[PDB]
Amino acid sequence: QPRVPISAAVIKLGNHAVAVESLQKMYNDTQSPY
Amino acid sequence: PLNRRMQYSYYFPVGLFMPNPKTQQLPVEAWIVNKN
Amino acid sequence: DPTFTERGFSKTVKSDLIAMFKRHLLEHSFFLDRAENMGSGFSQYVRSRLSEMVAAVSVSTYTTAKGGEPVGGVFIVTDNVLRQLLTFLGE
Amino acid sequence: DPTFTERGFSKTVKSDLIAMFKRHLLEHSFFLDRAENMGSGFSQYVRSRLSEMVAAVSVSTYTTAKGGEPVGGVFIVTDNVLRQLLTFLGE
């Protein structure tokens, strides 16, 4: 299957990277508590 | 050849009377430190 | 932590763990306000706390785009913590 | 150290070595907790202690991948020291 690029801020903490992101914008649009 | 022995002289006084600002302690000896 | 697991578990090491709970609670907790509070070295401080947070839980299906690095985890922060992480971790 | 070997070995230089043992024991030992303890300059401090640790023991069969640099040694750390080295030595 074709792999699509999804958006994520990727910080590299040493030898392996991690993809830090937040969903506060997804909860604020529906006026829901995060 | 770039490990030259640098040699110079230190000097320090012992037993000097500090003059008064207008002095009950008087130095008989002075202290120093080793390389240790 | 492997250092307190490789000795097995004794009844002596339990007091060390209960004290280490308090020592990790008073210092490392709320690390971002401490990184704004302190002087220099905040980038190494934030990177250190995040790297210990990754190492606490320790083909690939999720790679980075311009490289091939597997992305090995995911942080879920708030929107106020995301930018304060992205400024202290600039690159 | 070549500086105390190039003079040969005398009985005078032995006291210097026995004092230098204590001076290297009190300062440079447990350097990673000192690098977390101090202020700035921890990257140069850790890089300095590791570079002195390489220089203490001083075609190639083990090269780096994206370059051709021979890898000239290997550090074996624990898992708690590996990430605290990889944060202070970022690149």
Q: 3-class secondary structure for chain A?
A: CCCCCCCCEEEEECCEEEEEEECHHHHHCCCCCC
Residue A4 with chain C: CB contacts under 8 Å: none
Neighbour count for residue D36 (Cβ, 10 Å): 15
> Residue D37 is inside which H or E element, if any?
helix D31-37
Whether the CB-CB separation of D40 and D88 falls below 8 Å is answered with: no
CA separation for the pair D24, D41 (Å, rounded): 20
- Going by C-beta distance under 8 Å and a sequence separation of 6 or more, which residues neighbour residue A8? A19, A20, A21, C71, C74
Shortest CB distance from D3 goes to which of B3, B35, B36?
B3
Report the candidate in D51, D28, D37, D52 with the shortest Cα–Cα distance to residue D84.
D37
Q: Supply D60's token pair.
A: 């190639």
∠ CA D64-D68-D73 to the nearest 5 degrees? 50
Residue D6 with chain B: CB contacts under 8 Å: 3
Please give the span between the terminal C-alpha atoms of chain C, in angstroms, as a whole number. 29
How close, in Å, is residue A8 to chain C by CA atoms?
9
Size of interface A-C (CB pairs under 8 A): 64
Report the candidate in D54, D31, D47 with the shortest Cα–Cα distance to residue D90.
D47
CA separation for the pair D32, C58 (Å, rounded): 21
Largest pairwise CA distance in chain B: 57
- Alpha-carbon distance values, C7 to C47, C78, D78 (Å): 29, 38, 15
Q: Supply D68's token pair.
A: 């051709």
